[PDB]
Each structure stands twice: as C-alpha cells, then as structure tokens.
UniProtKB/Swiss-Prot annotation:
An annotated GO cellular component: extracellular region
Tissue: Expressed by the venom gland.
Keyword Signal tagged: yes
Name under which the protein is recorded: U1-agatoxin-Ta1a
Entry-annotated residues carrying Lysine amide: 51
Species: Eratigena agrestis
Amino acid sequence: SEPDEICRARMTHKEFNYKSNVCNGCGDQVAACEAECFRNDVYTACHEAQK
C-alpha cells in the first residue's frame, strides 16, 4: 500500500494517465492536484481551465 499505489489499484490505467496529465498541466499545483487522486477543487479548476 504505497502512496500512489492504492489509488492506482482502484482506477484503470487509462483513467489514471488521463487525470495525471490534467494535474500535470495545472502548473505548480501538480502536487496539490495529485493530493486527492485528482479529487479536489484544484483538479476541477485545472481541468475546467483546460480546453
């Protein structure tokens, strides 16, 4: 049960890769965005900000 191990084990690779790209495109909030497996308001803000 590692940091980004348990989270991944609950999601598919396609979903994990997709969301990861969204958070990575968020800027310096990468870690914040990644905090809750992309389940956070920053993720929404970042995701909504990306076309």
